[PDB]
RNA sequence: CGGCACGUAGCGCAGCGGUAGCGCACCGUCAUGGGGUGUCGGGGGUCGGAGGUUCAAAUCCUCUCGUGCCGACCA
RNA sequence: CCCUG
RNA sequence: UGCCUGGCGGCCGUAGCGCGGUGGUCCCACCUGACCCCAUGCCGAACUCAGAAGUGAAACGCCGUAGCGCCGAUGGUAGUGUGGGGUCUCCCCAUGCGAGAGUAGGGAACUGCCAGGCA
RNA sequence: CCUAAAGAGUAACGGAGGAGCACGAAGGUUGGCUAAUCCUGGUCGGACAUCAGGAGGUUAGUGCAAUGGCAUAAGCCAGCUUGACUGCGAGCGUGACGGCGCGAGCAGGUGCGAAAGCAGGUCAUAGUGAUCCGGUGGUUCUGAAUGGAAGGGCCAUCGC
RNA sequence: UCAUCCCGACUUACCAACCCGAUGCAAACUGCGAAUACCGGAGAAUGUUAUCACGGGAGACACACGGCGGGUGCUAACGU
């Protein structure tokens, strides 16, 4: 209900993004996770971006 | 014992007024002057009637 | 009028009454009224029988009631179509098989106990009989 | 009147799928269950909803083992 | 430390004498001494808990646990895991220095002191006691205190019964009445 | 108590190794002595054993409960395991922390030839 | 008979997870020759009953017995 | 505003 | 070869509790210290390390003891498949299977590998 | 969950309860720990706050209903992290079908651990919506004379 | 009821927690537990392949009673 969708876009600049859900009421700060990126084959920083 | 969180702690001389000195490892730093110790408390040393008051009051 | 003080569930299935009862022995007292037929006993029937026993004997001896009406019975109110939910709870019964020692008593002479059991059996809806404590 | 009941769920088709003494292929489901009613023994894996599957071919075989008397399923290799 | 020397030099053989044991370590020891101070008004103000923790650090020479609520209780308006107490545990040479401090400074300084109750044992040889005013303690000074406060003391020992514990404490000349 | 606590700690690793079916290099540590056994995957038959209570180790070692004891018994169990022909074992700390004497044991075995 | 609305101080009424509130009324003192009106200052409630969850229940749920309303229709 | 017949 | 001890298993209460006794040459445990390796949301309590003065107190092992827990017959009873039958809410007969509870009784475990001490 | 007749399945306006979520830690690993309740003792502190000891043995707990689980803990605590990965998938369960679910193993890269190893979300089972029509980003895959472009396709994803 | 500040002392018309002993009951109880049933393997006989797969054509998806196990109803109904 209160969790809304966000996309984690890569810092490799290839425009590849995962999508998760987030509770912005509890945690206003952004989300950065080192996750696998399939086009650059490296575990790279995925940072929060709006839908 | 960790390091750098416990309160600061050295040896201190203490002196009780009955002529007593003792050697105590503590935190206040300065030496201690003591009112009463275990060697001079009345309980520790052990130093801790109507008809008689009537007779002494109104003796005949 | 006997009734459990609280129960896990408000309504219960109809069930069956097959088999022969245990508790077929006189346990506490000496002289017992034991069922021979098979059927249900309303808590009202239990109360009426117990009253008949105690006021026939006039408060000597002691009376044990070896059955308890734990089973709720529903009845649908009149002029109501079939279905639309199980009916409301109406009274409580105890399923009694043959050979169930229903009532038990002690401290009383034999003829008086037999007479009191005769009044009790007249109030009961099922076949009963008189039994005596055996040492084994 | 009206009822507050009338709800139920679809049945989940639990239970033992391959009984004692079956010949099983690799990856075949032995038991679907809620929790480890049956525990995994040799050559048996326990998938994330506690589904017991055969990690290798062979003959499936039930046992009781352990100090707490638990049912274990194993695959005795053919 | 000198109390430990007193123990190892005379108290063990004295215990041997009046109890007729078979072992010098049938002679009981002091297992631990823990100091508690329940500061349950922290729900009203958490800062006085910090002041109290500083005071208990001052007496103990040791940083205390800020212990939290085990289970939420309606009557005292506490939630589970809320910091409402302070505690230290004392072992070894710290037993002996703090016990020396207590038995040779603090119990002479108790206001209207008449001795301690010998019935304060818990039935298993362990002793407990309650101090009402920490100002009887010279580890804290008079005019820098904020609130009157007390604490409670437990000496847990390996003694198997109350008579064993009271015999040990009488060997240390603990003021029973 | 401490023995049952150590057994409870070791049970997870021991059943994991028993399910994997690997030969086990089990350590047992006492304040005075240390013992090490390489045992079969069946869990009932040992392959080799080495301990500080043996004369052929205690005669040249000074004290039996130190890092030197751990290193010597690790060296010894390593060559007897190699000459019996294992080359491949999985470690079993048996609830002891992987630190100090147990660590010195494992390092001695690893440097003296076992890979784990 | 089926819903759905409410049981709050002596009375009339708000409040519908942690606090019980307003008015009339009662009491005490002033003002009056005295009463009323007026002025000052107080108190008063198992929150309808019972039991279930929750750290906690007036507030959430179930049943209960009261009062009100809307329907108990085609034949 | 009122003042028991 | 025998006894004792430790480790790892088999087995999962006939094996577990209780009560009484017994052991420290070796082993084990308690233990002695801990500025150091490491550690305590405080404490060398635990964990870790360096040792070996003392103790088998606790622990642990062993032995004895049914006060229990546990196992457990034979027969009987309940139930039930199949075929028939009745007074058909429930029972009966032929036949096959055959409980649970309880009783007599059993029962204070047995065993494999390695290592150490003594004989 | 029961009805449901000891495989599965099985109806009723049959009997009882829940959901339309939550969490970047409440996930991964490593390491450690064990509950409820009661009694005794103790300053405010009382029946119940904190501490010590004893009995007890999961009668606790599980983010939320019930059932089945759980001590090797799936329960509690701390350190480090992002496997809540990408392309696949032997085989199997379950559905009339659309579908749903389990899954060893392979390749790339990673986290934890000394390593053996574990990790493709949470103890499991609820927490959800086909298709069309569009919207956003990438991919020349196509591109109505040719080069582009629009539009379309594919991949990711959004709006009942 | 006696003393009634803390204390404390009596009797129960009495009510009774825990535990122990004994007797029952449960669809939503299980420290036990069948008969049947169901899955699989081997074996002999019998059966007009009775089995499975694919393709052509359907019909049917209003059932009734009786037996046994049950829910519901009144263990009422030629009820459901
Ligand atoms: Mg009309
Ligand atoms: Mg008038
Ligand atoms: Mg130590
Ligand atoms: Mg002993
Ligand atoms: Mg039997
Ligand atoms: Mg024994
Ligand atoms: Mg079934
Ligand atoms: Mg069936
Ligand atoms: Mg069908
Ligand atoms: Mg672990
Ligand atoms: Mg977890
Ligand atoms: Mg979780
Ligand atoms: Mg869950
Ligand atoms: Mg063109
Ligand atoms: Mg053109
Ligand atoms: Mg496009
Ligand atoms: Mg139709
Ligand atoms: Mg139909
Ligand atoms: Mg039909
Ligand atoms: Mg019909
Ligand atoms: Zn003095």
Swiss-Prot record, chain A:
SUPFAM superfamilies to which the protein is assigned, alphabetical: Zn-binding ribosomal proteins
GO cellular component term, pick one: cytosolic large ribosomal subunit
PROSITE patterns: RIBOSOMAL_L33 (PS00582)
HAMAP family referenced in this protein's UniProt entry, alphabetically: Ribosomal_bL33 (MF_00294)
Quaternary structure and partners: Part of the 50S ribosomal subunit. Cross-links to the P and E site tRNAs.
Leftover remarks: Surface exposed on the 50S subunit.
Name by which UniProt lists this protein: Large ribosomal subunit protein bL33
Species, as recorded: Escherichia coli (strain K12)
UniProtKB/Swiss-Prot annotation, chain C:
Keywords annotated in UniProt: Hydroxylation, Methylation, Ribonucleoprotein, Ribosomal protein, RNA-binding, rRNA-binding, tRNA-binding
Tagged with keyword RNA-binding: yes
GO cellular component: cytoplasm; cytosolic large ribosomal subunit
PTM text: Is hydroxylated on Arg-81 by RoxA. The modification is nearly suppressed when E.coli is grown in anoxia.
Cytoplasm among keywords: no
Superkingdom: Bacteria
Gene3D superfamilies: Ribosomal protein L10e/L16
Modified residues ((3R)-3-hydroxyarginine): 81
PROSITE patterns attached to this UniProt entry: RIBOSOMAL_L16_1 (PS00586), RIBOSOMAL_L16_2 (PS00701)
GO process annotations (BP): cytoplasmic translation; ribosomal large subunit assembly
N-methylmethionine found at: 1
Xref: InterPro entries: Ribosomal_uL16 (IPR047873), Ribosomal_uL16_bact-type (IPR000114), Ribosomal_uL16_CS (IPR020798), Ribosomal_uL16_dom (IPR016180), Ribosomal_uL16_sf (IPR036920)
Entry's family note: Belongs to the universal ribosomal protein uL16 family.
Subunit record text: Part of the 50S ribosomal subunit. Cross-links to the A and P site tRNAs. Interacts with assembly factor DarP(YjgA).
Database matches in NCBIfam families: rplP_bact (TIGR01164)
Protein task: Binds directly to 23S ribosomal RNA and is located at the A site of the peptidyltransferase center. It contacts the A and P site tRNAs. One of the last ribosomal proteins to be assembled in the 50S subunit. The simultaneous presence of uL16 and bL36 probably triggers ObgE's GTPase activity and eventual dissociation from the mature 50S ribosmal subunit. It has an essential role in subunit assembly.
Name recorded for this polypeptide: Large ribosomal subunit protein uL16
Organism whose genome encodes this protein: Escherichia coli (strain K12)
UniProtKB/Swiss-Prot annotation, chain D:
Lineage: Bacteria, Pseudomonadati, Pseudomonadota, Gammaproteobacteria, Enterobacterales
Superkingdom classification of source: Bacteria
Entry's Gene Ontology BP terms: assembly of large subunit precursor of preribosome; cytoplasmic translation; cytosolic ribosome assembly; positive regulation of ribosome biogenesis; regulation of cell growth; ribosomal large subunit assembly
Protein name (record): Large ribosomal subunit protein bL27
Subunit structure: Part of the 50S ribosomal subunit. Cross-links to the 23S rRNA. Cross-links to the A and P site tRNAs.
InterPro entries named among the record's database cross-references: Ribosomal_bL27, Ribosomal_bL27_CS
Residue segments, region Disordered: 1-13
GO molecular-function term, one example from the UniProt record: structural constituent of ribosome
Record has RNA-binding as a keyword: yes
Keyword terms of this UniProt record: Ribonucleoprotein, Ribosomal protein, RNA-binding, rRNA-binding, tRNA-binding
NCBIfam families attached to this UniProt entry: L27 (TIGR00062)
Signal peptide coordinates: none
CC per GO annotation: cytoplasm; cytosolic large ribosomal subunit
Homology family: Belongs to the bacterial ribosomal protein bL27 family.
From Swiss-Prot, chain F:
UniProt entry tagged with the keyword Nucleotidyltransferase: no
GO cellular component annotations of the record: cytoplasm; cytosol; cytosolic large ribosomal subunit
Record GO terms (molecular function): 5S rRNA binding; structural constituent of ribosome
InterPro entries recorded: Ribosomal_uL18_bac-type, Ribosomal_uL18_bac/euk
Superkingdom of the organism of origin: Bacteria
Family matches, as Pfam families: Ribosomal_L18p
Post-translational note: The protein has been shown to contain a phosphoserine, which was required for the protein to bind to 5S rRNA. However, the presence of this phosphoserine is controversial, and it has not been seen by mass spectrometry.
Gene Ontology process terms (BP): cytoplasmic translation
Function text: This is one of the proteins that mediates the attachment of the 5S rRNA subcomplex onto the large ribosomal subunit where it forms part of the central protuberance. Binds stably to 5S rRNA; increases binding abilities of L5 in a cooperative fashion; both proteins together confer 23S rRNA binding. The 5S rRNA and some of its associated proteins might help stabilize positioning of ribosome-bound tRNAs.
NCBIfam families (UniProt xref): L18_bact (TIGR00060)
Subunit structure: Part of the 50S ribosomal subunit; part of the 5S rRNA/L5/L18/L25 subcomplex. Contacts the 5S and 23S rRNAs.
Protein name: Large ribosomal subunit protein uL18
Origin species: Escherichia coli (strain K12)
